[PDB]
Amino acid sequence: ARPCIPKSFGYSSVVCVCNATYCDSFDPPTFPALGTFSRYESTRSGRRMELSMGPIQANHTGTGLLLTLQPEQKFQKVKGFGGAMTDAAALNILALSPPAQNLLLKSYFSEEGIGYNIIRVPMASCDFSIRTYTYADTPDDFQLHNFSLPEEDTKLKIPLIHRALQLAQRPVSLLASPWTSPTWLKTNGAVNGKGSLKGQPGDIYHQTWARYFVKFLDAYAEHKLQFWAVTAENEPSAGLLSGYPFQCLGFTPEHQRDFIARDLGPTLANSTHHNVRLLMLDDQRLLLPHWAKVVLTDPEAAKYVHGIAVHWYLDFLAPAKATLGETHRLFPNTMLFASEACVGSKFWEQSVRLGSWDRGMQYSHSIITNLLYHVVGWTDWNLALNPEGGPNWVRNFVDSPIIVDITKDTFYKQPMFYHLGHFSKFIPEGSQRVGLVASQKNDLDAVALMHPDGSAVVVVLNRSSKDVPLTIKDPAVGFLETISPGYSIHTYLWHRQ
Amino acid sequence: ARPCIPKSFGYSSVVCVCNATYCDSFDFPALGTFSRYESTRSGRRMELSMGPIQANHTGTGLLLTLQPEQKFQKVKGFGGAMTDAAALNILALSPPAQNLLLKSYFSEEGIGYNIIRVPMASCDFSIRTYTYADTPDDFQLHNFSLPEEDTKLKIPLIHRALQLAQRPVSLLASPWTSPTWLKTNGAVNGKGSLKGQPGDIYHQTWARYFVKFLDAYAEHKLQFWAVTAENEPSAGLLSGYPFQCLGFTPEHQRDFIARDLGPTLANSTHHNVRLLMLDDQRLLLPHWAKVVLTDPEAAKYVHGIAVHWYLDFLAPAKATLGETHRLFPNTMLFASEACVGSKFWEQSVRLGSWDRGMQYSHSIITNLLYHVVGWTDWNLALNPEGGPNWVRNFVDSPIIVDITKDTFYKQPMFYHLGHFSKFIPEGSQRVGLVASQKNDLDAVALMHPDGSAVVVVLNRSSKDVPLTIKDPAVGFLETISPGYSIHTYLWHRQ
Numbered sequence: 008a009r010p011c012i013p014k015s016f017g018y019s020s021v022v023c024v025c026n027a028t029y030c031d032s033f034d035p036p037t038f039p040a041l042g043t044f045s046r047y048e049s050t051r052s053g054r055r056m057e058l059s060m061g062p063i064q065a066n067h068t069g070t071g072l073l074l075t076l077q078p079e080q081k082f083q084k085v086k087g088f089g090g091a092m093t094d095a096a097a098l099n100i101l102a103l104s105p106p107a108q109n110l111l112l113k114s115y116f117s118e119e120g121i122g123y124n125i126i127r128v129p130m131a132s133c134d135f136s137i138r139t140y141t142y143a144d145t146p147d148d149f150q151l152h153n154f155s156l157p158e159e160d161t162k163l164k165i166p167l168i169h170r171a172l173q174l175a176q177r178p179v180s181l182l183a184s185p186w187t188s189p190t191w192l193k194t195n196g197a198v199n200g201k202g203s204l205k206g207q208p209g210d211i212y213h214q215t216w217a218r219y220f221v222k223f224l225d226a227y228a229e230h231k232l233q234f235w236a237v238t239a240e241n242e243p244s245a246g247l248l249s250g251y252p253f254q255c256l257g258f259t260p261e262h263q264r265d266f267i268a269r270d271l272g273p274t275l276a277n278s279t280h281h282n283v284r285l286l287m288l289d290d291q292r293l294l295l296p297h298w299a300k301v302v303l304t305d306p307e308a309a310k311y312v313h314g315i316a317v318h319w320y321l322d323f324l325a326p327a328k329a330t331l332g333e334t335h336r337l338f339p340n341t342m343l344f345a346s347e348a349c350v351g352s353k354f355w356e357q358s359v360r361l362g363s364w365d366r367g368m369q370y371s372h373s374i375i376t377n378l379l380y381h382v383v384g385w386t387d388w389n390l391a392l393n394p395e396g397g398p399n400w401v402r403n404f405v406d407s408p409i410i411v412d413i414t415k416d417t418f419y420k421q422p423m424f425y426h427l428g429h430f431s432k433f434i435p436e437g438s439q440r441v442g443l444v445a446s447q448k449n450d451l452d453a454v455a456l457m458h459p460d461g462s463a464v465v466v467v468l469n470r471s472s473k474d475v476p477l478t479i480k481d482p483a484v485g486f487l488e489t490i491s492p493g494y495s496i497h498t499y500l501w502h503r504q
Numbered sequence: 505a506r507p508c509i510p511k512s513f514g515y516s517s518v519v520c521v522c523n524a525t526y527c528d529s530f531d532f533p534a535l536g537t538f539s540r541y542e543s544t545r546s547g548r549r550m551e552l553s554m555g556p557i558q559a560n561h562t563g564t565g566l567l568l569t570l571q572p573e574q575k576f577q578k579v580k581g582f583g584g585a586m587t588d589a590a591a592l593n594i595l596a597l598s599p600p601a602q603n604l605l606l607k608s609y610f611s612e613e614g615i616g617y618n619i620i621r622v623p624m625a626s627c628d629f630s631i632r633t634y635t636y637a638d639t640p641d642d643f644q645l646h647n648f649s650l651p652e653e654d655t656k657l658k659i660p661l662i663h664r665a666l667q668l669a670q671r672p673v674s675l676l677a678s679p680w681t682s683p684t685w686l687k688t689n690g691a692v693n694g695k696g697s698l699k700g701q702p703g704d705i706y707h708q709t710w711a712r713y714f715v716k717f718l719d720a721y722a723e724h725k726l727q728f729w730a731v732t733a734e735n736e737p738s739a740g741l742l743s744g745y746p747f748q749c750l751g752f753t754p755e756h757q758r759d760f761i762a763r764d765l766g767p768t769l770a771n772s773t774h775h776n777v778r779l780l781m782l783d784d785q786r787l788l789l790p791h792w793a794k795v796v797l798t799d800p801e802a803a804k805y806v807h808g809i810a811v812h813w814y815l816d817f818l819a820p821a822k823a824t825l826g827e828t829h830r831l832f833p834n835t836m837l838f839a840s841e842a843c844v845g846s847k848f849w850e851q852s853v854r855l856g857s858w859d860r861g862m863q864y865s866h867s868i869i870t871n872l873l874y875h876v877v878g879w880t881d882w883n884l885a886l887n888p889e890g891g892p893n894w895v896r897n898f899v900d901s902p903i904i905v906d907i908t909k910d911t912f913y914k915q916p917m918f919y920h921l922g923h924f925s926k927f928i929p930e931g932s933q934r935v936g937l938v939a940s941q942k943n944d945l946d947a948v949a950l951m952h953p954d955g956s957a958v959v960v961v962l963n964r965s966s967k968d969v970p971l972t973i974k975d976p977a978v979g980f981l982e983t984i985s986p987g988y989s990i991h992t993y994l995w996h997r998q
């Protein structure tokens with residue numbers, strides 16, 4: 008319906024400029040006839056999820072790259088895609104005028120946008136908070152008599168989550184994760200640095216901490232918000248490092264295993280929130296398969312664990328096959344879910360690089376690899392940040408798919424937004440990854456899925472400078488003859504019989 | 505010979521204060537007696553005590569049994585890097601303070617280092633950018649020369665280190681970047697590799713640069729044990745990599761070694777210098793070794809695999825070192841650089857950190873238990889900010905120099921390193937050591953070239969662990985490993 012208003016900030020590609028009266032959007036889906044396909048294309052040169060259509064041919068003659076669909080080779084079912092409602096993201100969004108806020112929320116959550124169906128919600132403060140706090144800061148309040156949600160929840164996160172669900176196309180799943188417990192429950196008495204819960208699983212400290220999760224879920228339920236899942240701790244391995252600068256709570260895999268079995272698992276199961284899923288790990292995949300083996304070989308722990316949450320930061324050091332692949336081989340019934348990702352955190356990195364095609368490609372390469380290795384969903388970090396990549400109470404400034412410019416009542420949709428949308432918009436919950444084989448070695452990243460209705464979706468990413476002529480074969484429909492231009496991402500859709 | 509002058513900076517343990525006139529220093533018992541060197545978080549610094557080895561042991565307590573006929577790798581040694589930053593910090597002290605610092609590391613009154621890693625020109629731990637051949641398009645390397653960093657700082661200091669050492673010291677050289685006129689991006693840093701392809705003028709000139717370097721240091725009466733093919737070759741593959749780098753995929757390194765580096769070094773008067781591959785994060789193994797070592801032309805020139813160790817990464821060594829040794833048992837593994845943190849993010853100095861000490865010793869034990877022949881620390885000395893560094897990529901070091909007080913601080917990392925370096929001479933062999941029951945201790949047993957035993961025991965837990973060490977030739981060693989302690993046991997076997 009409305010095209011991208013491009014703006015170059017001097018980096019490799021453009022951003023799309025939005026404000027109080029204008030934002031780029033899509034028209035409702037059309038249903039292209041059997042024997043034809045739809046293509047959505049984004050390019051470094053500036054195209055942003057542009058729609059084209061073409062024929063599917065009965066025949067193909069050539070020696071070129073062929074990608075063959077194998078619809079009978081079934082893999083994982085998709086849960087979804089989304090991002091995090093941090094204090095920083097909520098503050099930024101709400102500092103825009105109300106019409107600009109609605110266009111930003113529609114961009115992410117509506118069918119006119121990219122159809123997010125996951126919101127990650129931190130349990131109290133984390134680095135993208137402007138201050139440190141927990142829900143139970145009165146010291147030694149073991150009964151949690153003074154447990155309460157501050158304005159960060161009641162005035163910022165909760166109102167925005169309600170507005171996102173009201174605008175959403177699809178049912179939205181909320182995921183909760185804690186960074187720190189109250190300081191009086193920790194060995195170091197501080198929100199950050201090396202420290203774990205005091206004592207041992209089954210004791211007063213571990214029982215209070217598990218009850219805090221029920222109190223959190225109760226408080227959100229009083230605000231008409233229900234969670235799909237909770238993680239056992241955000242980055243539990245971070246709390247084992249001396250000088251760790253952000254809110255954390257250290258758990259070795261044995262400690263996580265025992266806390267789940269003795270405290271979190273039974274406390275959750277014996278509450279009105281027993282249907283809420285529990286995800287373990289919520290950390291780097293380099294900790295796999297070892298962390299899954301420690302937790303999931305204990306049946307008292309394994310019985311409470313629905314899935315394994317992974318963060319992307321060490322993916323370049325942890326081959327997918329040895330980590331995700333081996334974890335799936337060992338525990339095929341325990342889903343793998345990517346729960347956090349952001350660019351810009353390395354020591355020399357510019358926090359925000361308005362229009363970076365490289366940062367968009369990093370997102371789509373990650374999503375594809377994860378989908379090729381049994382992962383059921385992918386979650387971005389901050390839904391929005393300012394042009395400095397904040398605010399943040401610890402000067403850790405990073406990038407985000409949407410950058411809010413408060414002084415201009417304007418927001419910018421980065422290449423990451425569109426790279427993520429090439430998946431989120433076209434792969435609804437319940438879609439299933441299917442086989443897709445290449446005829447020869449190639450430089451493309453591709454994945455194929457089938458929608459619940461039987462229609463096909465193929466995402467093709469080209470991270471090379473060269474155009475790659477390509478054919479996609481559906482054994483029941485035919486050959487989709489195409490070209491994957493250098494530095495492009497395409498999403499192909501087509502009806503099947 | 506002189507005890508630790510402790511000082512706290514608000515961290516878990518103390519540093520040892522040294523100055524122009526004072527520094528803590530050191531001084532084998534008869535068969536039937538053992539020596540114990542203990543360091544504790546509470547303040548003990550490689551304290552010597554002795555005790556009996558008894559013929560009999562009755563009990564159900566933890567038993568570590570020495571397996572002398574189970575022989576593993578032989579040790580090359582231990583040391584650290586003489587970066588520009590290390591040399592500037594050391595030379596900032598008055599000459600008597602510099603000598604106590606150098607004796608701390610290299611003398612027998614110190615911790616007996618026998619390895620010095622020498623960067624070939626600038627890196628991040630430099631105060632400026634430079635190479636040895638910055639005059640453009642000098643393919644014959646006629647304008648190749650060593651600057652002040654080598655001739656006034658590094659070379660005189662290495663000479664002073666070798667004078668103080670009783671053990672032969674091995675030098676190891678590594679380049680960060682080539683001259684920029686040999687690079688695809690024409691820059692010291694960023695994503696860029698050598699121009700063209702192996703066998704050509706660019707690759708030939710770069711191979712010749714290694715020989716010119718070895719020739720230059722040979723004129724300064726310095727010979728090298730080994731060179732690495734490139735410091736962290738994966739770095740120059742990253743867009744916007746912030747400091748000195750030269751990118752190589754494993755395929756490119758394989759072909760440059762096979763076509764240029766290997767033949768050039770073999771045809772030169774430095775043909776005896778060993779060539780080490782990878783010189784990057786151990787997490788890149790086994791993939792990197794599989795690519796290079798499966799090519800016979802590359803395999804004939806590669807002596808070993810140099811690995812880096814960033815201590816914040818929690819990963820199983822069996823997957824990297826273990827699998828690499830299983831695939832290439834005749835290719836030695838050597839740790840060429842280790843330091844705190846996670847490479848790509850930021851850190852600060854923690855004066856007196858016992859946690860960082862424990863990271864070092866836990867890492868050395870892991871390496872030795874997984875066939876690694878040596879362990880090289882990064883910068884030998886840093887200032888209190890963990891510099892100087894031209895891109896602010898600060899990190900901790902075992903020795904911190906405070907110019908304003910003409911003082912230097914010896915960190916727990918120094919002593920954790922010393923529990924190995926001082927007691928494990930070159931030629932020592934790792935031997936089997938078996939635990940009777942599952943435990944919280946990190947332990948390694950080695951045999952000195954003379955047959956004597958050395959056992960290092962690290963206790964990372966808060967609890968005191970009683971234990972017995974069984975040697976079938978001498979008897980039993982009855983001891984206690986206190987919480988947050990590191991011990992080195994020594995005893996004659998005959």
Ligand SMILES: *[C@@H]1O[C@H](CO)[C@@H](O[C@@H]2O[C@H](CO)[C@@H](O)[C@H](O)[C@H]2NC(C)=O)[C@H](O)[C@H]1NC(C)=O
Binds near residue numbers: 012025026027029
């Ligand atoms: C919000 O963004 C829109 C889109 O860029 C702006 O609309 C343009 O405004 C100029 C000046 O009035 C017109 O000449 C263009 O034709 C408009 N473009 C479109 C596509 O309508 C709008 O002005 C911006 N609003 C603010 C307050 O900056």
Ligand SMILES: COc1ccc(-c2cnc3c(cc(C4CCN(C(C)=O)CC4)n3C)n2)cc1
Binds near residue numbers: 252320850
């Ligand atoms: C003081 O300012 C700052 C302090 C710290 C920061 C800052 C920001 N992002 C960071 C880090 C460390 C990591 C890594 C380390 C390696 N990993 C492990 C071992 O699991 C994964 C996580 N990330 C992603 N530090 C930024 C700014």
Ligand SMILES: *[C@@H]1O[C@H](CO)[C@@H](O)[C@H](O)[C@H]1NC(C)=O
Binds near residue numbers: 524526
């Ligand atoms: C050097 O250290 C020793 C031991 O602590 C002390 O006695 C002496 O006064 C110090 N010298 C200076 C110049 O500070």
Ligand SMILES: [Cl-]
Binds near residue numbers: 817
């Ligand atoms: Cl590493």
